[PDB]
Design a protein around this nucleic acid. Structure first.
Lengths: 141, 83, 129, 76, 150
RNA sequence: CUUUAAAUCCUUUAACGAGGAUCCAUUGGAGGGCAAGUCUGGUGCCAGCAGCCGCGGUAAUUCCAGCUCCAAUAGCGUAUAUUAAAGUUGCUGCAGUUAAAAAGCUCGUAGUUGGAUCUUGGGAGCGGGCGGGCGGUCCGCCGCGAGGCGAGCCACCGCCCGU
RNA sequence: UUAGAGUGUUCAAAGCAGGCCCGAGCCGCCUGGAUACCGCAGCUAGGAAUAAUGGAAUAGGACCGCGGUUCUAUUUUGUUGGUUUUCGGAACUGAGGCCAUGAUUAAGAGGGACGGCCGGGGGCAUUCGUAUUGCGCCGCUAGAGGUGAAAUUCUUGGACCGGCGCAAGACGGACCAGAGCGAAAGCAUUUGCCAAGAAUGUUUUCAUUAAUCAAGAACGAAAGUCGGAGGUUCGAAGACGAUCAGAUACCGUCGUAGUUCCGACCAUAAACGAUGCCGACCGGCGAUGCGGCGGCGUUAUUCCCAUGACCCGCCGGGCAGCUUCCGGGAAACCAAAGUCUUUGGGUUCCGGGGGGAGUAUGGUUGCAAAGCUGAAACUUAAAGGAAUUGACGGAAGGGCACCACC
């Protein structure tokens, strides 16, 4: 059930150079089409303005209306949905605001009740969203 | 524990194995003589013949090869295993 | 067919030791196999054996003893550069305290402890413990 | 090969060792070498000993010094 | 097991351990060496020559009583066949089947067995060609082959 | 004063310089994994929390806060790339009847692997050396210079055991 | 830089620095800053077990032997200067020699021959058996088919039934089995013919010729396609009659393609043992097929004898079976799915959570149907295997109850 020979080092090698492609944890990270469809250019964060403010429901077991934002990036000009993670911190978000967006916490997947949103908002017009909540900073009006 | 000698088995267990599976292999055939019915020129003949033999002393067939052992037409003196 | 005629003999005794027999016969013979079993017998792992002779090959009978636990073979015949020997006897042996691995060598076939004193290496054959 | 005049093409087998596995991997690299035009009776498939030289041509560097196989061949 | 039809068959002969003259009928090598020629001249492959010496004359083995086996004897005198005795017959079966194959076309069994047999022959050619028994420029054709054989 | 082209900081001696908010310690948690509240007020499948399992419809151990405790401590959470975990890329080291999985079967060139066999045997040989019962000894006791023992500093010898 | 030795940078991270001895009287001393590691490839030299590889088979090693041609000089009277010899060597060449004169064995590897068989193995011809449908003739009658019940259907133009024949196309029942062969798909009427094959039996031959297998090639049930001939039965599509609320379904009467045959395409099936090939080993037992062997009686013959048929056993190779805690496994199960942390006999293909998908596109084969090769975006927390308890069954086996029936 193996090669195991002593002049076979090439076949053990051109087999594993072939069967690595079926490890989806490796096919994604080593094929140019996986990163291309990423709205980020592989970056950690990406700035971009806010072009509306919309809410999205939750999955079947538990009901709610998660609040979100329709952020358009400036890097690629794409359009993505960004969750606004905080308690009632949709009062500081406004149209044409240039918010900073980060990965949601599952390396390119949804999390929990939120359907189809993989992005959360960390800053809002160059002030930290945590700072606005706890009050340390203040967004000038 | 089924601990039995594979070196010194009975001369009668050795016939309970194939021609090849014995201690030291040896053929199951035996070279035999035949007295050539009607004459006294005694010829050799191999027990597991695969060919007929015809006797000038008989002008009739002597051994008939059938299966994997010979059958002799008429009885004769049969020495054996002088080898 | 038969390729590693050392491997088949060792599996023939290993399967016969597991059952609990006292004697076992192996079908082919060789200096490689005779000089092998002598290494075991020089440690007392087995009893005292006989080597039936023919014109064809020879067939060894061994008087097994209840002292060896497993008698493996390792193929392909690798190399042991005497810096890998300490790796081998730690991922292929039960412990350092006992058990030996036999590796062929420019000075005959000998278990690894012999190799250290004679300060040499060479290809590897198998192991027991 | 006993192709283009005054030079021959020689295969050269050898083993390359892969580090990851403890196993070898056969390769080969075949190169052109000049010849001594003294020679008919240089068959193919036979060993030869070759020496280095100044760059005789675009791909002719090594040159032939003495051929080494006639016994394993036909009539005396 | 076999090489083309499955089954670990086992019916081979078994030489005795004793390597001596029979000592019931010597008829020493002078007779046998000059005797084999009569059978080989009369026309019998080295495969069948052993039978008649064994079955009626009485010989343990030609390799025992004489010096060398039945081909090395026939090699020196000049009575070695044109083609090796195993190859010659393999062509016969390859030729007779092809003869039957050109008539009973839909006989799919023959059209298969012919593929095995041409594979057996081409395997023996690539072995003999190394051992110089057959010339390098030899080639089995399946058309020019029946003219080599009766 | 010292440092150094020139100053800068550490280092050395000055004059001051701590009573609880003076000289005020954080970043994340308290359902499980995973250390720590079946504590109080609010909210009522709302707000929201939650990497995952999940909490929220009147007694919320999970939300928002207060108090008490827990983790790391001038550091600590978040995002993504990456390694170990991974015996889930497996040469050491995976699996293939049913859990994804063996070409319908055979032939077969490259490629990989390939039966057995050329002292698998000794000498009171000769001698050197480790430990070892030994016969001997310079040697150590013992003795009356008529004598008794061989191992224990020093080892020596002909010899055996130890692969 | 990794490791590491020496050293009190106040410690350490670091750094290759530093320690004495005295006011200084020496017109200074002692030192440091090393070592290992650094594959693969190249060079060198000891070792020669294992693994490649070599040598005299239609003559080759050995003996300073005695012979020829052809030449290259060293230096002796000619110091140098031209000429002849011998020796030494080199090239090809004449007789016999000393070789113990050169060929390991023949594998529970393989090819091949040989002998008596064996098999629903393959092809071609030949032959038979009933059955079905159709028809001719004769008989008697009013119903015949068909379903759960009927109706379309069949007859006043004599159906179904009964008898004697004629024609056609399919198919081989009963024998027929956990029995046989084939690589697999698969194969069952008597006879003949052509060629092949496993297994046994062998004191025959060759002497490693062999295992596995990318690319490639032959065969590949059913269905389907292309042309010719035939079309009995069955019968996708189709038209009807039924049941149903609907029933373009199951059910019933018709019926095209098709089914069978010869010549080519197609290359797919739960083509299944859902279980690669070759090789070795580890338990018993009663049987089955073929071959050979040993057997005491019987039966076919008047005679062991040739030989069958029975009856007792052995051996090899098969299809398979029962049992066991050898041992595996998630377990159902397994003499392989065992010899697996105590892992390594050799080799081929292939899987990495489920879905999108065997989809799109690209290449390629195909007359067409389609086959081979074959992604990603996105989505999802579970898909999935074996057993255990219940529940449930328009699932069978027992049994009870007027909240059940007769």
């Amino acid at each position: 059930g193996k090669c195991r020979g002593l002049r076979t080092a090439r076949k053990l090698r051109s087999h594993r150079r072939d069967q690595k492609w079926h490890d989806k944890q490796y096919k994604k990270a080593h094929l140019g089409t996986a990163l291309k469809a990423n709205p980020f250019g592989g970056a950690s964060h990406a700035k971009g303005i806010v072009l509306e403010k919309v809410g999205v429901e939750a999955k079947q077991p538990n009901s709610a209306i998660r609040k979100c934002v329709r952020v358009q990036l400036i890097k690629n000009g794409k359009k993505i949905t960004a969750f606004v993670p905080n308690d009632g911190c949709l009062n500081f978000i406004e149209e044409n605001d240039e918010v900073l967006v980060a990965g949601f916490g599952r390396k390119g997947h949804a999390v929990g009740d939120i359907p189809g949103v993989r992005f959360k908002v960390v800053k809002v017009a160059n002030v930290s969203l945590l700072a606005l909540y706890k009050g340390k900073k203040e967004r000038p009006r | 524990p089924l601990a039995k000698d594979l070196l010194h088995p009975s001369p009668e267990e050795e016939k309970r194995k194939h021609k090849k599976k014995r201690l030291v292999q040896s053929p199951n055939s035996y070279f035999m003589d035949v007295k050539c019915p009607g004459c006294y020129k005694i010829t050799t003949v191999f027990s597991h013949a695969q060919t007929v033999v015809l006797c000038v002393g008989c002008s009739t067939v002597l051994c008939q090869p059938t299966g994997g052992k010979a059958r002799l037409t008429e009885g004769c003196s049969f020495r054996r295993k002088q080898h | 067919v038969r390729m590693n005629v050392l491997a088949d003999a060792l599996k023939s005794i290993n399967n016969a030791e597991k059952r609990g027999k006292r004697q076992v016969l192996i079908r082919p013979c060789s200096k490689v196999i005779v000089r092998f079993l002598t290494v075991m017998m020089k440690h007392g792992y087995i009893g005292e054996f006989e080597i039936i002779d023919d014109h064809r090959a020879g067939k060894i009978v061994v008087n097994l003893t209840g002292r060896l636990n497993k008698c493996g073979v390792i193929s392909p015949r690798f190399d042991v550069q005497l810096k890998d020997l300490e790796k081998w006897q730690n991922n292929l042996l039960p412990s350092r305290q006992f058990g030996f691995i036999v590796l062929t060598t420019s000075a005959g076939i000998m278990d690894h402890e012999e190799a250290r004193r004679k300060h040499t290496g060479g290809k590897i054959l198998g192991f027991f413990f | 090969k006993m192709k283009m005049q005054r030079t021959i093409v020689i295969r050269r087998d050898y083993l390359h060792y892969i580090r990851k596995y403890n196993r070898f991997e056969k390769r080969h690299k075949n190169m052109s070498v000049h010849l001594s035009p003294c020679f008919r009776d240089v068959q193919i498939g036979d060993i030869v000993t070759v020496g280095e030289c100044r760059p005789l041509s675009k791909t002719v560097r090594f040159n032939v010094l003495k051929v080494t196989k006639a016994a394993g061949t036909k009539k005396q | 097991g076999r090489m083309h039809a499955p089954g670990k068959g086992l019916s081979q002969s078994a030489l005795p351990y004793r390597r001596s003259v029979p000592t019931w009928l010597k008829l020493t090598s002078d007779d046998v060496k000059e005797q084999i020629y009569k059978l080989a001249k009369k026309g019998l492959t080295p495969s069948q020559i052993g039978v008649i010496l064994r079955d009626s004359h009485g010989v343990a083995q030609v390799r025992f009583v004489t010096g060398n086996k039945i081909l090395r004897i026939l090699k020196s005198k000049g009575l070695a066949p044109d083609l090796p005795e195993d190859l010659y017959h393999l062509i016969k079966k390859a030729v007779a089947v092809r003869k039957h194959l050109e008539r009973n076309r839909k006989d799919k069994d023959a059209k298969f067995r012919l593929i095995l047999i041409e594979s057996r022959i081409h395997r023996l050619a690539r072995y003999y060609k190394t051992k110089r028994v057959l010339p390098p420029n030899w080639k089995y054709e399946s058309s020019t082959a029946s003219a080599l054989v009766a």
